[PDB]
Amino acid sequence: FVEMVDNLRGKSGQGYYVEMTVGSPPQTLNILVDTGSSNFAVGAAPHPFLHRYYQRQLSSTYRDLRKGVYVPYTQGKWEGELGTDLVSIPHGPNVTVRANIAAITESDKFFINGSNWEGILGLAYAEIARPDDSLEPFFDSLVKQTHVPNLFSLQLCGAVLASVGGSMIIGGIDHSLYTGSLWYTPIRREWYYEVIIVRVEINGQDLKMDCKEYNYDKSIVDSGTTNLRLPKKVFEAAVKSIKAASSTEKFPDGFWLGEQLVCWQAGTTPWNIFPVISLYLMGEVTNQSFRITILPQQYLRPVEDVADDCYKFAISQSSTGTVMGAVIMEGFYVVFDRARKRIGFAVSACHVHDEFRTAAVEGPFVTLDMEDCGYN
């Protein structure tokens, strides 16, 4: 799968996007890769902050589905008109598919002011598709209409704003993108890419919480979220343990909550004074787990737009459960193995790390009562 390697691009804090083509003749658009949603939604109107947009009138193969959608979020929101059209991926498999498309006609706090993408490729399952599960997601259509195997994998690499890159391998796994072995965790339910975190460790030390807390109300793997988001009780326990672990220098209480930055002298970044973070995921076999481990390079993010100088704490509290965002996924090569209801983790060949430590995917470990860690 050499032709799909390095097919993702982006800027720091603005997500990873892939080039796609929509309509006949083909209109080129840059589309955010999003494992935490399920709509293929593109800007269909001349928003002043978008570079490009989908012009339905120019497409001979566009079919109107005569149905609106209104999708609000915690802050942002979009509205659009449903349809279908012929979609392709230039740096993907040599195929063309009839996919559902939400033509976004109005939005607020959805598009990023001066990013280089014009839509979202929701890669999750139909259950969370707006307006309902009858709207077939893009990847479900691709698999049905072609011989592309029912899996994809993401290598998100990370860094005025720094220019990031990566790979979305569609229909397979590229072994040059990871070191060591892939370790697999079951997809608990096919809606989001839901998983079960069974144990958390900060600097080798267990938080010793009831493992329902770790997955309350769920844990997901989400390429469309920056932070490692943790449930409130888990976040407090984690921050307290990170604080005790990093007692070289002291910071204000606003830094841990993401209410302010922290800054050092230029080119004197203290990585060594912060701990590694380990999440134990449920394994393939009864009573078996494995642990993925991230470095401070993943969760202390350099912020480039100040007016490496300054940094932000990219672990935050959530009321929507755990979200294993870019902070997690920049450490690992992630295989979304839909055909076998599982998600693979391996150490990524492009993850940022120092001379002393690296990210890791280690196992197997014996953990009891792992199914009790799920929330219902």
Q: Which residues are catalytic?
A: 34, 222
d(CA 62, CA 68): 16
Would you say 70 or 251 has its CB closer to ligand 52K?
A: 70
Q: Decide the pairing of beta strands 228-231 and 315-318.
A: parallel
Q: Of these, 242, 314, 326, 328, which contacts ligand 52K (CB under 6 A)?
A: 326
CA dihedral 53, 54, 58, 64 (to 10 degrees): -150
CB of 37 vs ligand 52K, minimal distance in Å: 4
Give the binding range for ligand 52K (CB under 6 A) out of 10-18, 86-94, 144-152, 332-340.
10-18
Q: Of these, 137, 224, 321, 344, which contacts ligand 52K (CB under 6 A)?
A: 224
User: Among 240, 234, 257, 254, which Cα is nearest to 322's?
Assistant: 234
The residues in 243-262 that bind ligand 52K, with binding defined as CB under 6 A, are: none
Residue written as token pair 């999003």: 34
CB of 211 vs ligand 52K, minimal distance in Å: 24
Q: Of these, 15, 80, 137, 275, which contacts ligand 52K (CB under 6 A)?
A: 15
CB 178 within 8 A of CB 359: no
Amino acid at 90: P
The CA angle 27-28-30, to the nearest 5 degrees, is 140
Residue 37 binds: one of ligand 52K, Cl ion, none (C-beta under 5 to 8 A by kind): ligand 52K
The pairs formed by 52-56 with CB atoms below 8 angstroms and a separation of 24 or more are: 52/27, 52/28, 52/118, 53/29, 53/118, 54/22, 54/23, 54/27, 54/29, 54/101, 54/103, 54/118, 54/119, 55/23, 55/27, 56/23, 56/83, 56/85, 56/103
Q: Residue 116, interface with ligand 52K (CB under 6 A)?
A: no
d(CA 275, CA 239): 11
The residues in 92-111 that bind ligand 52K, with binding defined as CB under 6 A, are: 110
CB 183 within 8 A of CB 345: yes
Q: Of these, 226, 289, 293, 318, which contacts ligand 52K (CB under 6 A)?
A: 226
Q: Residue 34, interface with ligand 52K (CB under 6 A)?
A: yes
The interface mask with Cl ion, positions 274-303, x = CB under 5 A, is ------------------------------
Classify residue 303 as exposed, middle or buried by CB count within 10 Å of its CB (0-12, 13-18, 19+): middle
The residues in 53-82 that bind Cl ion, with binding defined as CB under 5 A, are: 57
Would you say 57 or 75 has its CB closer to Cl ion?
A: 57
Q: Residue 225, interface with ligand 52K (CB under 6 A)?
A: yes
CB 95 within 8 A of CB 146: yes
CB of 61 vs Cl ion, minimal distance in Å: 12
Give the binding range for Cl ion (CB under 5 A) out of 51-59, 110-118, 282-290, 294-302.
51-59
Residue 119 binds: one of ligand 52K, Cl ion, none (C-beta under 5 to 8 A by kind): none
Q: Which residues in this chain contact ligand 52K in the complex, by CB under 6 A? A: 13-15, 32, 34, 36-37, 73, 110, 112, 120, 222, 224-226, 326
Binding site for Cl ion (CB under 5 A): 57
